Symmetry: C2
Subunit: 131 residues, 2 copies
């Protein structure tokens, strides 16, 4: 399977696992998105910490808007646990998650590690290729 990856992700552990999985990567510098699966499917990788920060600074929705305007079927993979991270009420996190997935209609898949993020990218790309 072939996946386009943004230059900023090139040396990540996600890319390492993708390569071990046999994925053929094409590097590009994208204005939006981290891993492109097709003309319509693009994946944005965001750490749990960065998700919370974007909620704190009120920048999450602008980011989702930008993703949707660039791709018809964008996907956000949130990496790392969202629990145990104080300084932010659980309802703020839950509320943001519900808004993105239900209102903006952008799937939010949760990954525990960069390796798991790669496994998700891989299985989605494979399905893309098969159909």
């Amino acid at each position: 399977v072939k996946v386009v990856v943004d230059s900023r992700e090139l040396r990540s552990e996600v890319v390492k696992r993708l390569k071990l999985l046999g994925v053929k990567l094409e590097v590009k510098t994208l204005d939006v998105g981290d891993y492109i699966i097709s003309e319509d499917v693009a994946i944005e990788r965001k750490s749990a910490n960065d998700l919370i920060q974007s909620i704190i600074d009120g920048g999450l929705f602008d980011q989702v808007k930008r993703l949707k305007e660039a791709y018809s079927r964008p996907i956000m993979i949130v990496e790392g646990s969202l629990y145990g991270i104080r300084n932010v009420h659980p309802n703020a996190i839950r509320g943001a998650i519900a808004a993105v997935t239900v209102d903006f209609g952008v799937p939010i898949i949760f990954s525990s590690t960069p390796e798991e993020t790669a496994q998700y990218i891989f299985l989605i790309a494979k399905r893309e290729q098969e159909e």
Copy 2:
């Protein structure tokens, strides 16, 4: 806020928290869905164990199909951790999650406890009422 709840959920801890949150519940015996928010929004509550079992028995997709045919905007809340549950390869769980959220287009929100499930139902219902 008003929420319709299926009779089978009446004595759950989710209902207890919903009541503490001030939600006004109307009980019904639904052929599909556990908590109805509006004519279009319905929530299906599924434990992590039951999600895995439905993957093992190949019944998950039929369930999602049934939800979509009954409601235009269904939501699935998966309750409990999906990690540490052997007898099933991680890719089987990841694959199922990707299919439901990305292909079927049905959001899959993850909750750690029945209380969190109630908090999600509450915030979604409130937004429904406000708009």
